[PDB]
Amino acid sequence: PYVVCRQCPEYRRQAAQPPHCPDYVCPLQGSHALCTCCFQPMPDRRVEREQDPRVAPQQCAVCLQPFCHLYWGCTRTGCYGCLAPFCELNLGDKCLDGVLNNNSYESDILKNYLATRGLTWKNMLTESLVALQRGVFLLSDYRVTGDTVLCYCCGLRSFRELTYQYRQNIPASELPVAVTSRPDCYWGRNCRTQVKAHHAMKFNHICEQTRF
């Protein structure tokens, strides 16, 4: 497939098939990869970077998919900045929405707790990443640190896990009594019924599956 990117030489551009009517420059033997976020081609320089750390990262260290943001700036509605060190990743203004269990009721409780104290999601992440570094909080992607260069989706996935642990560690005395009065759901954080508003309001889902 003929491909022309931001950094392709002019001669390449003028040789593409024409439309229908009613510092780096790409070498001949080089290749292109499509940004997983914006679908636009960029020169694929990952192999080069392996022995030259001077080349900007072009992939998420967690899912290994390519993203163009650190390399030359990605633009798309819905794109907040799709590749970054985790501690600096832009998760968007709505990242607290459904952050706990995809459960708006549980999530609103956390939003209220943070807003009451004038805290932002950023403050919560910073505190959570301190705990992560001490080994007090844990991640499924267990090798991720605040310094890992990762994408929006992988960062968000870990932010949900850190946030759940942050929530877990809030003393009951610091939450409204209407929150703490609710009995634990037998099925815990993975309950499938908590997507229904009534069930979500009735039971606490910040807990684990009941076993014995």
Task: Give CA separation, 19 vs 15, 16, 22, 139, in Å.
Answer: 12, 9, 10, 49
How far apart CA 63 and CA 132 sit, in angstroms, is: 20
Half-sphere exposure of 72 (CA within 13 A, CB side): 16
- What is the smallest separation between the CB atom of 138 and Zn ion, expressed in angstroms? 19
Per-residue contact flags (x/-) with Zn ion for residues 26 to 65, judged by CB under 5 A: x--------x-xx---------------------x-xx--
- What is the smallest separation between the CB atom of 54 and Zn ion, expressed in angstroms? 19
129 binds Zn ion (CB under 5 A): no
Task: Give CA separation, 50 vs 59, 86, 146, 150, in Å.
Answer: 12, 21, 22, 17
Per-residue contact flags (x/-) with Zn ion for residues 140 to 159, judged by CB under 5 A: -----------x--x-----
Q: Which of 33, 71, 82, 113 binds Zn ion (CB under 5 A)?
A: 82
Beta-carbon count within 10 A of 36 CB? 19
Q: Which of 31, 193, 209, 210 binds Zn ion (CB under 5 A)?
A: 193
Q: Which of 89, 99, 191, 206 binds Zn ion (CB under 5 A)?
A: 191
Task: Give CA separation, 55 vs 49, 70, 150, 206, in Å.
Answer: 5, 10, 16, 43
8 Å CB contact between 171 and 180: no
5 binds Zn ion (CB under 5 A): yes
74 binds Zn ion (CB under 5 A): yes
Binding site for Zn ion (CB under 5 A): 5, 7-8, 26, 35, 37-38, 60, 62-63, 68, 74, 79, 82, 151, 154, 185, 187, 191, 193-194
